[PDB]
Write a protein that binds this ligand. Structure first.
Ligand SMILES: CC1=C(/C=C/C(C)=C/C=C/C(C)=C/C=C/C=C(C)/C=C/C=C(C)/C=C/C2=C(C)CCCC2(C)C)C(C)(C)CCC1
Ligand SMILES: CC1=C(/C=C/C(C)=C/C=C/C(C)=C/C=C/C=C(C)/C=C/C=C(C)/C=C/C2=C(C)CCCC2(C)C)C(C)(C)CCC1
Lengths: 221, 220
């Protein structure tokens, strides 16, 4: 349902439209240049480098995102700024390869191996900004320039391998330790994850906004 | 008291010492001999080489009253006592470890109690001195040196103090210590040898202070 910008409840119309689109976005809508969101794969590395906290997350795949409920949308066609507040009921799960070198609460965690983290009841606030741009057809496309993301990660449950590989019970106990510290670790990873999600949100929306014209999405302006 | 001129004397000393081991356990203060089971009041064991830094304090060893003496030799010409002994079953040592090491890829930094059990260990001891005319004309052997050659047998370990800040990781570091303990003990063996040597020197000197060479071994 295209939302007429002149219509009295355009903001509400976009909310409803986007909600409808989430289940279809799961495997992806390749006609609109939108990659799959459940699973959300083919992502950049997550990189955090702080003193006593070096983490790289590679081959990141997130499942569970087609259950997303949209709290709010605002499309401000004066500034070309889309704000979305969304929540996932239940869980999302991320998989990939961790490479960590960290001192966490007195304990050394150096090594590399697979990860699984479940996040229970996460939310996100996203802001996207751009400017309209006349393409060589004369057709006007929105060229997005920035995204910021505010992840509320919720409750983490974690199974992390690769620590003390040289003795299996020590590996098993390091997996256990990782689960206990997971709330705190995720909480301190939040600004890294924020900037990362921002970048992904920028790139994946730009793919949509390249393919579908601003006048086709939002008639009457 | 074994006679030096008696047909067999070397076997008499072996047998003498064998009889004495159970009595030595809590200690024989008439011959100036501290207890051997437990063997306590000992110096620190110290090792610092090759990124492997270990201090063992408050060391106490149990199980030593089951010691079998394989051989004794008392060489009155050089004043040299060589003993070969074995403990059937187990001796166990307890104390405080403070360690800072990388062992087989794993960091072990911390401090806590230790227990280490050795199954069927053995020892070769050599004690050397010279005769000394003591107060009122009895001859006492004044020992000057000792070496010890420990054969540690099969080590098993329960060691606390590593990753204290999460209990399962401490429990797994205790497990890891048991698996590496043969190797660790084998590389500690020169440190342990010099330490035991010192103890054996000090503890025998106390005995050889009190009981004269002529009383122990008549007719020489
Ligand atoms: C669908 C969609 C949407 C939405 C979305 C969302 C809502 C998202 C989210 C997202 C999220 C919410 C995310 C998150 C993530 C995270 C992660 C992935 C992380 C990771 C982590 C880890 C892995 C960790 C680890 C560790 C530990 C725990 C311990 C220590 C060690 C270590 C470091 C290893 C929207 C509206 C836009 C529209 C369109 C479509
Ligand atoms: C009775 C007697 C005798 C003998 C004796 C003997 C036979 C002895 C023995 C002894 C011995 C044979 C000893 C041993 C000892 C040892 C030790 C004391 C050890 C220790 C160890 C440890 C404690 C360790 C630890 C650890 C580990 C294991 C791992 C890593 C970490 C650590 C390093 C912590 C005679 C005849 C001379 C006479 C007099 C009396």
């Amino acid at each position: 349902q295209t939302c007429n910008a002149s219509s009295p409840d355009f903001q509400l119309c976009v909310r409803a439209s986007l909600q409808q689109l989430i289940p279809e976005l799961a495997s992806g809508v390749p006609s609109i240049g939108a990659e799959g969101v459940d699973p959300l794969r083919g992502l950049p590395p997550i990189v955090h480098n702080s003193n006593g906290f070096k983490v790289q997350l590679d081959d990141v795949s997130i499942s569970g995102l087609s259950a997303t409920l949209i709290n709010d949308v605002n499309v401000d066609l004066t500034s070309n700024t889309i704000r979305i507040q969304a929540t996932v009921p239940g869980y999302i799960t991320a998989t990939g390869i961790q490479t960590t070198d960290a001192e966490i609460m007195g304990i050394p965690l150096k090594g590399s191996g697979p990860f699984t983290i479940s996040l229970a009841n996460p939310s996100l606030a996203v802001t996207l900004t751009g400017a309209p741009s006349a393409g060589p057809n004369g057709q006007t496309y929105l060229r997005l320039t920035s995204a910021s993301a505010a992840i509320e990660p919720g409750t983490p449950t974690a199974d992390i391998k690769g620590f003390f590989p040289q003795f299996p019970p020590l590996e098993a106990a390091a997996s256990a330790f990782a689960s206990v510290v997971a709330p705190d670790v995720v909480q301190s990873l939040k600004p890294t994850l924020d900037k990362w999600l921002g970048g992904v949100a920028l790139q994946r929306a730009q793919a949509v906004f390249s393919s579908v014209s601003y006048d086709a999405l939002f008639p009457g302006r």
